[PDB]
Structures are given as C-alpha cells and as structure tokens.
Amino acid sequence: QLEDDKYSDLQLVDEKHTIKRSVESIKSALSLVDDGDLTLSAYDTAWVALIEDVNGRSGFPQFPSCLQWIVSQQLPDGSWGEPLMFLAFDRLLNTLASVVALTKWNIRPDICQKGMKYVLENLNKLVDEKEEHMTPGFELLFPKLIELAQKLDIKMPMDSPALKELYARRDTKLAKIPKKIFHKMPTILLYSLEGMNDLEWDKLLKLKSENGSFLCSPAATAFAFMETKDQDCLAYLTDLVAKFNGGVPTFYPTDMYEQIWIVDRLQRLGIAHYFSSEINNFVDHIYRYWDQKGISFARKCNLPDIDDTAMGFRVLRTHGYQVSSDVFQHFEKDGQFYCYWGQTAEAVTVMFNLYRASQVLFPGEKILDNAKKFAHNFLTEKVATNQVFDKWIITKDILGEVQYALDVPWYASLPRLEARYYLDQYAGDGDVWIAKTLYRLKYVSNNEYLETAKLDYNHCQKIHKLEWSYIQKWFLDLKIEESINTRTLWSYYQAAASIFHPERYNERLAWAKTNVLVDTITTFFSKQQMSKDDIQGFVNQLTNQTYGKMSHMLIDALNETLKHISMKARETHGIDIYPHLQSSWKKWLLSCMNGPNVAGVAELIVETINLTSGRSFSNDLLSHPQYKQITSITNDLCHQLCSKGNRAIGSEIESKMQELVQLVFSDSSDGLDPDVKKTYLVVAKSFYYMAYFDAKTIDSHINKVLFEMVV
C-alpha cells in the first residue's frame, strides 16, 4: 500500500535531513575520541587519594582533587558505584574504598558514616550470593579494604559468616598464585596487585607498562607507589588525575579497545558508511600500534589479550591492512585458546569475537581454521546446553548475537541481514561491562547510535519497498510470457540486501534486472531446447540468422532494459555504458554456447555494477593482471555454488572463497582498486547465501529485511 503519506516524497526528504542531522551529531561526538572515555571509579579514585603528600606535608593528600570527586559522587543510600546497574560487589568495593580514603584525611564524617552504614548493612547479605556472581578479584580486593579500614579504627564484624567465608576464599586464591611466573612476566594478576602479598618489588618493578603503570590500573599503580615510591608510577597517576578532574576509571588508557569496538558496532549497525572519515582515522591508529605479539586494550599496556587481538585483526584485514594470523599463536596452547596466560578464553563473547575473526582467514592459515572449529563447537554447545551467557557482561541479547553467528556464516551474511538482526540486539546505553568494577563505554554503547541506525534502516527499507513495486511494474511492462514469481522477489532482494544505499539505486536496480533477465533467458534456452547454433543466432540479433518471434521479443526486451539502465546511469556519471553492457551480455551469452549457462553470470553481474557505478572508468581495469585473476576465481566460485545442486558446500568451495577473500583484502598500492575488488566479494557472497539457505529460510529473511520495519 504505497499510496500512504509515509511513502510520499516530501516525507522521505524530511527523513533524510533528520538522519543527516543525527549523523553530524555523531560525527562531532566522535571528533572528541582520544585515549578513552570510561565510567569513573570511586574504588580507583579512593586508592589514588590514599597517597600521602610526597614533599612531607604531613596531614595532606598528594591528590586532593580525588577526595573532592569522591565527596561529590555519593548516592542517596550512602553507597558509591554504577548508579543504574546495581551489583552488590560493585557497591561494596566502591563504597568502602571511598570511606577509607575520606576517613584517612578526616573529610566529611557525615558522609563516612552514611557510607559505613551501607557497608555494614550489606556485608551480611554476601552469604545469599552464590560463588559465580562475585566480581573478579573481590575475594582479594575487598579484604584489603577491610584491612585498611581496621587500621583507621573502623570496626568491622570479623566474626560475621559473610566475612569468615570471604576470607576463606581469599586464602585459597592467594595459595594458588604462581609466584615465580607472576614475578617473571606481565600477567593479568598485576591488574589486581593491590590485593596481594608476598611481593618481590625488585622483580615486579621490571613489569611496569610503558606509561609507568601496572597494567594501566590506577589502584594497582597507586598501591605500588605507596609500597615503593616509584617515580614512573607517580607520573602515570599525576597525568591521570589532571585529565578527569580527580576521578579516575578502573583502567586507563583504553584507546585500542575503544576505537576497535567503535568500528565494530558502527559496522554491525549498518551505518558505518556515514563515518568513513572517522573510521579510517580509527583504523589508522589501530594499525600504527599493531604488534605481532598481539595488542592490549591500550597501546601503552604491556599485556596483550586475545579479544583485542581478534577484533583488531578482523577490523584491520577487512579494511585492507596486511596482518599475519601468526599473532594468534601467542594465545594458543595445546589446542586451547587463552585470553592471556592463566586464563582460558572461556567467555562467550570472547569466543564469539574469535569465531568472527577466524572466518576472514586466507588459504593456508591453519591456526584460524583451528580457531573456527574450536570456537564454533564451544558456541554451539553453549547454545544447545542453554548456557549462552557471560558472567561478566550485562547485555541485551547475547544469545541472539551468538545465534546469528552460528546460523549465518560470514560468507552468507548479507549487509542488510546482519544489520536487521543486530538492530534488535544492540543494547545502546544498557551495555555494562564488568572488570574490577562496573563500567560503561559511551562511544561503543549508546542510544544515539541505535536510534540513528534504526531510522536509517527503516528509511532505506521504505526506498526498497518503493523500488520493489517499480521492479514488478517494469517486468510486467516487458510482457513476454511470464508473471511476478517468487524468483522475481529473490532477484531484487539479492541486490537490495547487499547494495542497499538509497544513493546507489542505479547499481542495485541494474543488478536486480540482470538477475531477472538471466533467469528469463536461461529458462528460455532450456524450454526451447536451443542448440549452440541457436544461441549463436540469438547473439547476432542483440548486436546486429535469428528466428522465432519470442526470440526477437526477448532480445528487444533485453536491449530496452540496457538502454534504460545506461540512461539512468547518466545521472551518476557522464560516460555512456550501453556499448559496454551489450558487450558484457554478448560475452555471457557466448559462454552459454561452450558450457554451463551459470559459468559467467557472476562476471556479468559484477561488470554491470562496476559500469553503472562508473568504477570501470575511474580505474583502468583493462589488463591489470588482478582483473583476469579475480574474474576467473569469481566465475569459478559462482559456477561451483549455483551448480552444486543438493550437495553441501564442501571444502573446495570454502577454499575458493578464501582465495577470493585473500585477493580482495590484500590491498597493494599498485593493486586493483579495492572498491572494484570488493564488488566481486559482494556478488560471491550473494551466491553463497542462496546456496546455503533453503527456500523457507530465504523467504523469512526477505520478509524481515524488506517488509518488517525495525521497532
């Protein structure tokens, strides 16, 4: 029912301006991205506030602004912590630390007492909390706070069942510490250094990160300074205390983690094309500080992790930067993958992100093939066992995200399909991550991305629905013998779900009509039992014998379509493409003489897209050696796919797609233009998609992508 007021042109115009305004808003907010924008932590701020004046000014703290920040942040119930997501351990850590800091420096006894009232009242309720919910290191960090409080004469209930139980778990964890390794190399243990004893600072001080911190943790670095007076540790804290007006987060910097996840989310939400300038800058930064040993959450932290590594790897490769899969060997041992030494990569989202990285593999990258099998099995079982949850991330629909990954390989993840599902899963402001304490990444998880992405999608969807009506009319006006069948909608959807942008209507519509006519021509060849000689005559009429009234009507219908396509393409660029389209169809039609009729369809579609877009003339494809190469791989690939039948997609097809991926994303300065290259992958995926899913699933995809507005 496109007679409504919402499909009117004036309404569509206002939506575009509204979308453009939101895009400019995001763009200005993204211009402020620097070293990381994280939740500030009262726990870490309190630890920094404990530092005594370094020039001997007895009775005064070194960082008074930290104490003032703490004062300003107390919640109405007397606690400190994440205001909107309540977590008992988060509140207890942030609150007792704040009380201890303020007590040490004799500040606001009224605030201290409200704070202690909350701690003492919620201490006993730790009994009612199971083991798997206690935040990382709590059994080490909270007892340490109790120790500091007792020495300030804050009396605690040490006979409480809750604390007797807590201190028991502290004792076992401390007994499990591998002291030698912990003192020999950077480990995740340094991030919780303040909760440990049995320290040989002679060796630990060799493990400082490049910015002078211990694992980029202000609390651990403040603890280290008070134990050792290390001047590098003090410099890290001084710079940090000046950047956020006293309040500090639970780790800093976080530039790699933040900028990588920005690119990922914008890409998955389907609006990354609006931020190519900003995304190119982010990816540039990621590549500049890429390391063959892996990357951390900060370029200046000395502990790489598999999650940052797997996400930066995938983002860098799909952006065209050369990166070796050998990096993952630093996170693999005896057939198992690890976040870092001592911590298996047992988290769902980490395995989710690893599975995603493994699928961009090139031929011969066995470690990525091992990772794919490993992660796919891990995730499939957590889905079957009804366990798709991460104890250390509060998100909206982690199950849906994992389900989509297992149901839709990357080779079959059409752009609009990926976005359509993620738009219902992305949490916006609601994503709360769990480290020592709860924190939020505003540049990664916010409601403005989601709202803008939903508006853009439903807007493109309105354009698609209008184009679909136009395609139905164009086909019927070519009254030859056929009707609007299911295959006609598939032919448009295949184009619209990949090249979806409203401004790219010429490419999308030309591809859609080409699918339709390829379907019609090949069906005609079959029904009429046309020989090679018959097809030969069919070609001569197209360009300049030929018999059969229906033959002449198909040739004219083809030529009229090509004339119309090139007509509309004049608005994009000025070069007349009709001769080149005729040549491309001549080449395909002649290929139907010598072999299967799907042998060169992919080349025909790709050339049509490159011509209507104008990329065939922006770059001299001509005899660039990669042109013949990518054309042959793609034709062979889509030959294997469309003519696989009822076989399953086997190893040979997977390997050929890997060949294409390697060519497409191995950008060189003198290589074929990347945008031209990526078109071949776009079409190949659309062939893979059609061979991977059954009819009923395709239909369900079509309804959701094209006809279900995003709520």
Numbering used by the authors: 19 to 562, 567 to 733
Task: Please give me the paper's original passages concerning this structure.
The first committed reaction in grindelic acid biosynthesis is the transformation of the core diterpenoid precursor geranylgeranyl diphosphate (GGPP) into the bicyclic intermediate 7,13-copalyl diphosphate (7,13-CPP) catalyzed by the class II diterpene synthase (diTPS) Grindelia robusta TPS2 (GrTPS2). GrTPS2 is mechanistically closely related to other class II diTPS enzymes that facilitate the protonation-dependent cyclization of GGPP to form a range of CPP intermediates via a common labda-13-en-8-yl+ diphosphate intermediate. All class II diTPS share a common three-domain (γβα) fold with the active site being formed by the N-terminal γ and β domains. A conserved catalytic DxDD motif controls the general acid-base mechanism to bring about the cyclization of GGPP with the middle Asp residue functioning as the general acid.
The N-terminal segment (residues 1–18) and a short region of the J-K loop in the α-domain (residues 563–566) are disordered in the GrTPS2 structure. Consistent with other class II diTPSs, the C-terminal α-domain lacks helices α1 and G1 and helices D, F, H, and I are shorter as compared to class I diTPSs resulting in a non-functional class I active site. AtCPS E211, predicted to be involved in substrate binding and the catalytic DIDD motif, including D325 as the general acid functioning in substrate protonation, is conserved in GrTPS2 (E157) and situated at the bottom of the active site cavity. By contrast, a His-Asn dyad, previously shown to be important for catalytic specificity in AtCPS and other ent-CPP synthases, is replaced with Tyr (Y209) and Thr (T268) residues located at the top of the active site. The presence of a solvent channel in GrTPS2 is shown to connect the catalytic DIDD motif with bulk solvent similar to AtCPS. While the removal of a larger side chain through Ala substitution resulted in a nearly complete loss of function, exchange to His or Phe showed activity loss to a lesser extent and increased production of 8,13-CPP, suggesting that the hydroxyl group of Y457 and presence of an aromatic ring in this position make an important contribution to directing catalysis toward deprotonation of labda-13-en-8-yl+ at the endocyclic C-7 methylene to form 7,13-CPP.
